Amino acid sequence: AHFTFQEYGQTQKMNLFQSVTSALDNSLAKDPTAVIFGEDVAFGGVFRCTVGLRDKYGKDRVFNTPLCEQGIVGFGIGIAVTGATAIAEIQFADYIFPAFDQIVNEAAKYRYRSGDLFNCGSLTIRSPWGCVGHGALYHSQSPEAFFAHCPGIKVVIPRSPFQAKGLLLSCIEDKNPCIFFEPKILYRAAAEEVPIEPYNIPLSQAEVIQEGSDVTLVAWGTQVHVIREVASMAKEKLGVSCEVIDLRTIIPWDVDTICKSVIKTGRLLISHEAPLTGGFASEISSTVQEECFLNLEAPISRVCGYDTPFPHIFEPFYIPDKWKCYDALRKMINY
Amino acid sequence: AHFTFQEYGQTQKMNLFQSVTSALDNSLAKDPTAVIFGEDVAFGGVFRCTVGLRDKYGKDRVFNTPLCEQGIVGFGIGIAVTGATAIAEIQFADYIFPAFDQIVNEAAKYRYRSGDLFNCGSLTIRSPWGCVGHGALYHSQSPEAFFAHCPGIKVVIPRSPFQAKGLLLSCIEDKNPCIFFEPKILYRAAAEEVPIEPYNIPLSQAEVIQEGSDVTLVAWGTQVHVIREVASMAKEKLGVSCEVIDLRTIIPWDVDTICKSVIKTGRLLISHEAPLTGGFASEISSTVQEECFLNLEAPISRVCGYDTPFPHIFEPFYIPDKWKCYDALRKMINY
Amino acid sequence: KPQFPGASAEFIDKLEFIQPNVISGIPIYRVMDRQGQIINPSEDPHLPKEKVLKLYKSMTLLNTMDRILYESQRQGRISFYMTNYGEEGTHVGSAAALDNTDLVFGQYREAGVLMYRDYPLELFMAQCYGNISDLGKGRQMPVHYGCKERHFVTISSPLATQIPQAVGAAYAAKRANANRVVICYFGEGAASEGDAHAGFNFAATLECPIIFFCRNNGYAISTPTSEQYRGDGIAARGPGYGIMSIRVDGNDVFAVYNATKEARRRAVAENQPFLIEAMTYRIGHHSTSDDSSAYRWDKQDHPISRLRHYLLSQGWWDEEQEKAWRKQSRRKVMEAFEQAERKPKPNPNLLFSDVYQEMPAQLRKQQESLARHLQTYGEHYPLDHFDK
Amino acid sequence: KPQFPGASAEFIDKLEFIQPNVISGIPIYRVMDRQGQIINPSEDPHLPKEKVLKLYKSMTLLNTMDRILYESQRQGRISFYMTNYGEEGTHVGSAAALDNTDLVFGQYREAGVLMYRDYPLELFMAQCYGNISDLGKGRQMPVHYGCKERHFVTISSPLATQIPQAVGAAYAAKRANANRVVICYFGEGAASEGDAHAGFNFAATLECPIIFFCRNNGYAISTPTSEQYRGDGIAARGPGYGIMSIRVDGNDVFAVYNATKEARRRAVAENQPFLIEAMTYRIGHHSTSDDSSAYRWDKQDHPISRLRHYLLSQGWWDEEQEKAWRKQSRRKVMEAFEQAERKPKPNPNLLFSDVYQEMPAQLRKQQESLARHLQTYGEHYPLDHFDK
Ligand SMILES: Cc1ncc(C[n+]2c([C@H](O)CC(C)C)sc(CCOP(=O)(O)OP(=O)(O)O)c2C)c(N)n1
Ligand SMILES: Cc1ncc(C[n+]2c([C@H](O)CC(C)C)sc(CCOP(=O)(O)OP(=O)(O)O)c2C)c(N)n1
Ligand SMILES: [Cl-]
Ligand SMILES: [Cl-]
Ligand SMILES: [Cl-]
Ligand SMILES: [Cl-]
Ligand SMILES: [K+]
Ligand SMILES: [K+]
Ligand SMILES: [K+]
Ligand SMILES: [K+]
Ligand SMILES: [Mn+2]
Ligand SMILES: [Mn+2]
């Protein structure tokens, strides 16, 4: 494994897929309009995220669609137009593209273009995301930067079971169409205490998970665990204090939390599995440079996937792992 | 108008649509495999770009497809797989999205994923692009940043009739799938001498169209004319010498030319009609900051469209016009 | 017997390809001839006088508005326009067969549905002018109408995207136990889009109370149907998806009405989709950006003419009434037109709201940036035209 | 007579919806019964002994390879696998009816087509292991096969994307005056995708020599066909697009062969698409990631069994031959397997080439960055497994 995974009433140990099911169960229990649909969701889903829900809530509320992503998203938009909560699943993020027109031209623009006479705010699209060791070109992708250039949608990526359930519930209840990307490598690997009852984590809010004073490290999804480890390597090997931040919401993103951190540390390294060019690290880096020019002691580093498609046998060489991140951090500290 | 428009054998005065037709005519004359197809191309196209070509070359080579962009691009990929030149048209860039999966998952990855046993290098997709005064949400868009995050395609945007014909011919002949975006406001407005016979302008090469020493201004398409004017305003009003660069190719982009300029001037302003967040200015700005940290005298400015859909009645307030650019430049000079 | 899960069928012991019936296609349902005479008494809906006069006055009022707004676009007073010439019968015939609260999704060439639902002239014109009375806040190009009060979902330019949306809204209605149908209008060009295949298949497999209404007017901009498809029009695709399908004379208000009325009744009762393909002819240019003589009814087969002949036969209209109405409708349209032209455009601030329900702080920053910009550089902008 | 440009039809004076024939669907063409007996002498293709033995040996060799590679995946030796159980007849029957240079596009469950075209065991295994012999350079997941020499376009995971591509390749072939057909395989799930509607319509309107070959095996992962569509399978959609269509028993090599042979002959001569829906049953799990007992032939209706009974009736096979071949095919598969396991993986440098034909300078920079990285941190990477 390229990574290691490390108030609210009663809790239970839950892995990431189970925390998704818990969020969905809580949602359907409290919102009689809510339905869940997509490919193979009825028998519990190819990642078990919907197990037991059809039995509990009924075949009219948890159901399979024909195999057509553009249909899935257009269908969910139309449910949400009536005011009903629509929780669409896209089987892998790699297969979200056929729905790109329905998401970007339709869902994102629905409220603006009608002057708020109509909306699809009660739509949420959930989709497994990110590398998985052997997914190759079409079961590995991280498409969040494509969506980040689209005003009108929200894009949210959790790093753990606890974070996943609170962020998913926020997406489901948020009055804007949301894409919730679930890091599939974590579905079984990451497990921790998760409240049985519903709770919310705010959207557009980054989380500083470790305070530090020498450099700011920013990532999201599984890559948060990579940078947490990098912070530990940097402390031990270099005597460098790293502030580790999970961005959580891609758009609209928490500019203030990131800039506040960089004003303090003077250095920033951003990492993501997606390709470098056009990746969302470029948006963060530009903005920070604009806001923290006087504080920046070194060029902002982006440690990302290469500008290639996501390979099968070469995955261990492709990903921005802890050594690539550490080496980049070392150099930036030396600057 | 928010803008003013200002070796190779015999030339003729041509507007931008005519220069496109000239490029296409030259291509079909010299390449017997080449075909042009899409919605309404047979009668000459909704912007007249294909007038006369079906008469000259035949109905098997210049033809209408059914109304289906995902079909248009998949069809063109399959022609290009056989080695034949496929010149697909997408009627407005706003309607490229239904083909996003065929472009990103298929065309861009075709050569890589087959180990070069198959390719679609002889595909070119051309599409009108950019604002037009009253196009509103779906006849105004500039989608180049969506495509910039996709390794394996090239994305090219000309600023004039002469540039359009030489860049289009390069795209048509380039051994990679290319998207050529034609700034539709310029179709009739911009007119200048254009060589009758074919010639090429290199891809991935920016053009410094005016040398300057105080600030670097970068744009592409119609926005080049806006920044050219801004350079003139800055010279007259501020005694500021601007280096004006047309990027031309979005990906792979000419990093060297931009960095060389910023090393000299120490200041950079990038402008584009597309929305700020996730726009391609963020990629340029991050990269320049990484490469020119020691030379940068001021934060890099991005003057872009707002993070909204493209409005109808508010267009004059939405676009990054010459005054918005000038004011941003003024402030950056004051920094 | 065959045991395959994918189909229910017998074996055949000889090789026979199934040929399409394109030359002898699905027949075209007609109720009245081109002289407005009822062909088959048993098909006559016997609509009451007031209703038939409303069908007639709605079509001609739309036609009056079309002529004025088309002229306004030619003069550069509005940026764009698309007329409804030749297709007025499909709009009003079908709208009259719907319940008032049935939800409508459209394409762009269905304004008669709104007119039949009493959408004010003032609001049609407010949208085309993008003025302060536009509830769409001037954000979309002209003819992109929407009315929450009249259950008409805001038009958007991307073709066929509303098809699977309409199906989702129909599924939600089923669940709500609505006694409501959704109708989804689209052209024969739009039917080529992948979203049409998605919507048709979802509607059948998810069992939704929806009417798909295809206006087949022979052209998609310059493209004739011979380059659009090769089977027997759109109606012949319905059965392949398991959808009950019919083809009607779209120039015959009563044929459109009858088919729509029966589809509505059955779609709502049975939770099953129906497809209606209305055959017509696009008399106008495609839009104000189109000169249709570049690539190709009015006098011998027009829905309005046919309806007018019908009224005369019942003794429900005459020359005097026609003249008075021609004048009254001109005056009504001209009054709304003049008002629409004198209204200001909305505050430029409205450029930023409704992107999200709330306004993100970073978006508010951009709005503030514009306000500061206009304070300094305002002389360079058309400010005197915009509210506030 | 109706005058509408969009369809060719008569008027009808009574309202009648067209109902789909789903209970009595398009019949299933069969040539031999489950005991391998020819049902109708006039349909017997009388393939020569050597050819029928090649159909048989190709299926069983594929089946042998499937069992071994499925076990290899269970043990974690390869990352992924998908078997072809129950569908071997569709692959070999159809491939045998094609000309050797007809271009094939596929989905992922068509490896028998390659096996019939003599694709080496070594190369099937090279792709699954991503080793140095893989011409795909280890870049795609297992079973994503492609062979330029054998005119089999590299498989990609996104469903149905190859459908409109196959049509474009078929148009290009027409132009080239090829006497070549394109065949495009896909499952009944993939047929729900918008790309299928695009490809079918383009093929008909642009008049392309293509065979669409749909393997209807009852399920798309967990989803039964009752949740996939509501019309009469995929074959009933063909006529709506103007495509000549047939349904065959996909467990009957000879029925598949005959339909494919006649479609090829006519598609090439007439420049017209043909649709073949082969009814089968997916005997295996969907893939190695699937346990199919979570949501639901082998002994009573299997293509291999049926073909074996046929050979016996001609006196073309016996128990002794079956035993010797079982042994020889096991040995051939095990030899390739052992070789495949001992080969190194390709140079990690190959991660960067073929993204574009040339390597952009900025991409070369990334390749250099990796080389420097591995010089310093190489102990932390599986380097001893990779070439160079
Ligand atoms: C996905 C996509 N592709 C292409 C188009 C371009 N187009 C149009 C516009 O942009 C419409 C706006 C002005 C409101 S309309 C149009 C022709 C559609 O023809 P149809 O037969 O469906 O409809 P009709 O004959 O009633 O105009 C096309 C190709 C479009 N709007 N959407
Ligand atoms: C556009 C899209 N959506 C969903 C899928 C997921 N999926 C699959 C994979 O990812 C395949 C890779 C492992 C090679 S296969 C699949 C089921 C396809 O069912 P079909 O009936 O078409 O084919 P078959 O029964 O032969 O498996 C789906 C939903 C997919 N590959 N593409
Ligand atoms: Cl996986
Ligand atoms: Cl335009
Ligand atoms: Cl001015
Ligand atoms: Cl290690
Ligand atoms: K939501
Ligand atoms: K090219
Ligand atoms: K639409
Ligand atoms: K594919
Ligand atoms: Mn039409
Ligand atoms: Mn299947």
Q: Tell me the CATH number at D346.
A: 3.40.50.970
Report the residue from D130, D190, D370 with minimal CB separation from A67: D190
D201, B69 Cβ separation under 8 angstroms: no
Given the CA of residue D186, which atom of ligand 2 is nearest to it? 22
Quote the distance between the C-alpha of residue A2 and its chain's center.
18
Fill in the DSSP letter of residue C87.
Answer: -
Query: Residue A160 and residue A152: Cα distance in Å, rounded?
Result: 26
Helix (H) or strand (E) holding B41: none
Chain A positions touching D380 (Cβ under 8 A) are: 323
Q: Indicate the residue type of C23.
A: I
Q: Which ligand neighbours the alpha carbon of B70 most closely?
A: 1
CA nearest D7: which of C226, C193, C94? C226
Q: How far is CA D200 from CA B89, B97, C60, C244, C381, in A?
A: 20, 21, 41, 22, 51
Best mutation site among C85, C141, C157 for ligand 1 pocket (most ligand atoms within 8 Å of CB): C157
Positive or negative CA dihedral for B317, B323, B326, B330? negative
Given the CA of residue D217, which atom of ligand 2 is nearest to it? 25
Question: Could you give the 3-state DSSP secondary structure of residue D179?
Answer: coil
Q: Is the CB of C157 under 6 A from ligand 1?
A: yes
Q: Would the CB atoms of D357 and B111 count as touching at under 8 Å?
A: yes
Q: For residue B77, what is the nearest residue in chain D, using CA coordinates?
A: D165
Question: Could you give the 3-state DSSP secondary structure of residue A95?
Answer: helix
φ/ψ (deg, to 5) at A77: -55, -50
Overall residue count recorded for chain B in this entry: 335
Q: Is the CB of D220 under 6 A from ligand 2?
A: yes
Query: Residue C9 and residue C15: Cα distance in Å, rounded?
Result: 15
B100, D338 Cβ separation under 8 angstroms: no
Q: A292 is written with which tokens?
A: 């923290």
Name the neighbours of B, counting chains with at least 3 Cβ pairs within 8 A.
A, C, D
Query: Residue C62 and residue C111: Cα distance in Å, rounded?
Result: 8
A107, A147 Cβ separation under 8 angstroms: no
Q: Is the CB of C287 under 6 A from ligand 1?
A: yes
φ/ψ (deg, to 5) at C181: -115, 160
DSSP B90-142: -SSGGG-GGGHHIIIIIGGGHHHHTTTSS--TTEEEEEEES--SS-TTTSS--
Chain A residues at the D interface, defined by Cβ less than 8 Å, are 39-40, 42-44, 46, 63-71, 94-95, 97-98, 133-139, 276-277, 306-309, 311-314, 316-318, 323-324, 327
Question: Could you give the 3-state DSSP secondary structure of residue A156?
Answer: strand
Q: B228 is written with which tokens?
A: 């050219």
A113, B309 Cβ separation under 8 angstroms: yes
CA distance B164 to chain D (A): 22
- Cβ neighbourhood burial of C93 (10 Å; 0-12, 13-18, 19+): buried
**CATH number for domain A207-331, candidates 2.40.50.140, 3.40.50.10470, 2.40.100.10, 3.40.50.920:** 3.40.50.920
**What angle, 0 to 180 degrees and rounded to 10, lies between the N-to-C axes of helices B280-292 and B255-265?**
60
DSSP B156-215: E--SSHHHHHHHHHHHHHSSS-EEEEEETTHHHH-EEEEESS-----SS--EEEE--SSE
Q: What was the resolution (in A) of this experimentally determined structure?
A: 1.8
Question: Could you give the 3-state DSSP secondary structure of residue B35?
Answer: strand
Quote the distance between the C-alpha of residue C32 and its chain's center.
23
Query: Residue D203 and residue B68: Cα distance in Å, rounded?
Result: 13
Question: Could you give the 3-state DSSP secondary structure of residue C270?
Answer: helix
Which residue's structure tokens are 């011998």? C300
Q: Would the CB atoms of A308 and B151 count as touching at under 8 Å?
A: yes
Q: Is the CB of C324 under 6 A from ligand 1?
A: no
- Which of B41, B51, B55, B68 to mutate against chain C (most C CBs within 10 Å)? B68
Spatial strand order of the sheet with D274-279 comes to: C11-12, D28-29, D244-249, D274-279, D210-216, D182-187, D103-105
CA atoms within 13 A on the CB side of D30: 25
Chain C positions touching D14 (Cβ under 8 A) are: 29, 40, 42-43
CB contact D146 to A (< 8 Å): no
- Cβ neighbourhood burial of B335 (10 Å; 0-12, 13-18, 19+): exposed
Catalytic residue check, D353: no
Q: Would the CB atoms of D159 and A67 count as touching at under 8 Å?
A: yes
Query: Residue A331 and residue B261: Cα distance in Å, rounded?
Result: 26
Among A2, A139, A225, A272, the active-site one is A139
DSSP C309-378: HHHHHHT---HHHHHHHHHHHHHHHHHHHHHHHHSPBPPGGGGSTTSSSS--HHHHHHHHHHHHHHHHHG
φ/ψ (deg, to 5) at C274: -130, 140
D120, D340 Cβ separation under 8 angstroms: no
**Fold of the CATH domain A10-206:** Rossmann fold (3.40.50)
Catalytic residue check, A225: no
Question: Could you give the 3-state DSSP secondary structure of residue B329?
Answer: helix
B83 Cα–ligand 8 center, Å: 11
CA nearest A39: which of A15, A73, A16, A81? A73
Which residue's structure tokens are 């060799």? D61
Report the residue from B145, B307, B308 with minimal CB separation from A278: B145
Give start and end residues of each alpha helix (H) in chain D.
49-74, 88-97, 111-116, 121-129, 162-176, 194-205, 253-270, 303-314, 319-342, 361-377
Catalytic positions of B, written as ranges: 69, 139
Helix (H) or strand (E) holding C182: strand C182-187
Q: How far is CA C200 from CA A75, A191, C240, D7, in A?
A: 11, 42, 10, 20
- Cβ neighbourhood burial of C327 (10 Å; 0-12, 13-18, 19+): exposed
Query: Residue B334 and residue C353: Cα distance in Å, rounded?
Result: 32
Query: Residue A129 and residue A143: Cα distance in Å, rounded?
Result: 8
Best mutation site among B91, B97, B137 for ligand 1 pocket (most ligand atoms within 8 Å of CB): B91
Q: How far is CA B235 from CA A230, B6, B231, B239, in A?
A: 49, 18, 6, 5
C367, C352 Cβ separation under 8 angstroms: yes
DSSP A30-75: H-TT-EEEETTTTTT-TTSTTTTHHHHH-TTTEEEPPS-HHHHHHH
Which residue's structure tokens are 């149908």? C181
Q: What is the largest CA-CA distance in chain B?
A: 60
Report the residue from A67, A134, A316 with minimal CB separation from D382: A316
Chain C positions touching A252 (Cβ under 8 A) are: 356, 360-363
Q: How far is CA A208 from CA A243, A244, A265, A289, D14, in A?
A: 7, 6, 13, 20, 72
Q: Would the CB atoms of C356 and A109 count as touching at under 8 Å?
A: no
Q: Indicate the residue type of A14.
A: M
Q: A15 is written with which tokens?
A: 């892995």
Query: Residue A51 and residue A72: Cα distance in Å, rounded?
Result: 20
Question: Could you give the 3-state DSSP secondary structure of residue C26?
Answer: coil
Query: Residue B185 and residue B160: Cα distance in Å, rounded?
Result: 11
- CA trace torsion B27, B32, B38, B44 (10° rounding): 60
Question: Could you give the 3-state DSSP secondary structure of residue B70?
Answer: helix
D285, D313 Cβ separation under 8 angstroms: no
CB contact C349 to B (< 8 Å): no
Among C91, C287, C302, C329, the active-site one is C287
Helix (H) or strand (E) holding D12: strand D11-12
Query: Residue A71 and residue C196: Cα distance in Å, rounded?
Result: 9
B176, B10 Cβ separation under 8 angstroms: no
CA atoms within 13 A on the CB side of B203: 24
Would you put residue A310 in left (φ > 0), alpha (ψ -120 to 50) or beta?
A: beta
D163, D186 Cβ separation under 8 angstroms: yes
Query: Residue C59 and residue C311: Cα distance in Å, rounded?
Result: 14
Q: Is the CB of B95 under 6 A from ligand 1?
A: yes
Q: Which residues make Cβ contacts (< 8 Å) with residue D84, sequence separation at least 6? A: D62, D63, D66, D91, D109, D110, D111, D112, D284
CB contact C383 to B (< 8 Å): no
Burial D230-249 (b: 16+ CB within 10 A, else e): bbbbbbbbbbbbbbbbbbbb
Query: Residue D102 and residue D138: Cα distance in Å, rounded?
Result: 26
HEC letters along A275-334: ECCCCHHHHHHHHHHHHHCCCCCCCCEEEEECCCCCCCCCHHHHCCCHHHHHHHHHHHHH
Q: What is the largest CA-CA distance in chain D?
A: 84
DSSP B220-244: -TTHHHHHHHHHHHHHHHH---EEE
Q: Number of A:C CB contacts under 8 A?
A: 148
Q: Which residues make Cβ contacts (< 8 Å) with residue C236, sequence separation at least 6? A: C20, C21, C25, C26, C245, D239, D240
Q: Would the CB atoms of C358 and A175 count as touching at under 8 Å?
A: yes
CA nearest B108: which of A280, A277, D175, D365? A277
CA nearest C183: which of C155, C209, C206, C215? C209
Given the CA of residue D220, which atom of ligand 2 is nearest to it? 19
Question: Could you give the 3-state DSSP secondary structure of residue A226?
Answer: helix
Query: Residue B319 and residue B325: Cα distance in Å, rounded?
Result: 10
Helix (H) or strand (E) holding D216: strand D210-216
CA nearest A88: which of C324, D27, C165? C165
Q: Would the CB atoms of A66 and D227 count as touching at under 8 Å?
A: yes
Please state whether the peptide bond connecting residue A32 to the residue before it is cis, i.e. omega within 30 degrees of 0.
Answer: no
Query: Residue C318 and residue C307: Cα distance in Å, rounded?
Result: 13
Q: Would the CB atoms of B67 and C345 count as touching at under 8 Å?
A: no
φ/ψ (deg, to 5) at A3: -150, 160
Q: A126 is written with which tokens?
A: 């959930």
Overall residue count recorded for chain D in this entry: 388
Could you say which residues from 41 to 70 on chain D have a Cβ atom under 8 Å away from some Cβ of chain C? 42-43
Q: Number of C:D CB contacts under 8 A?
A: 268
CA nearest A210: which of A242, A235, A240? A242
A184 Cα–ligand 3 center, Å: 7
CA distance B14 to chain A (A): 34
What are the residues facing D276 on neighbouring strands? D213, D246
Give the number of domains in chain C. Answer: 1
Q: Is the CB of C83 under 6 A from ligand 1?
A: no
Residue D196: domain span: 1-388
Q: How far is CA C43 from CA B135, C249, C266, D96, in A?
A: 46, 14, 17, 56
Fill in the DSSP letter of residue A141.
Answer: -
DSSP D289-337: T--GGGT--TTTS-HHHHHHHHHHHHT---HHHHHHHHHHHHHHHHHHH
Q: Which residues make Cβ contacts (< 8 Å) with residue A37, sequence separation at least 6? A: A62, A63, A64, A65, A72, A75, A76, A86, A87, A88, A89
Query: Residue B130 and residue B315: Cα distance in Å, rounded?
Result: 12
Give the angle C232-C237-C241 at the CA atoms, nearest 5°: 160
Given the CA of residue D228, which atom of ligand 2 is nearest to it? 21
Name the neighbours of D, counting chains with at least 3 Cβ pairs within 8 A.
A, B, C
Q: Number of A:D CB contacts under 8 A?
A: 124
Question: Could you give the 3-state DSSP secondary structure of residue D146?
Answer: coil
Q: How far is CA A111 from CA B81, C107, C170, C203, in A?
A: 41, 18, 20, 25
CB contact D193 to C (< 8 Å): yes
Query: Residue A209 and residue A232: Cα distance in Å, rounded?
Result: 13
Domain with CATH 3.40.50.920 in chain A: 207-331
Report the residue from D139, D142, D157 with minimal CB separation from A311: D139
Q: For residue D130, what is the nearest residue in chain A, using CA coordinates?
A: A313
CA distance A9 to chain D (A): 34
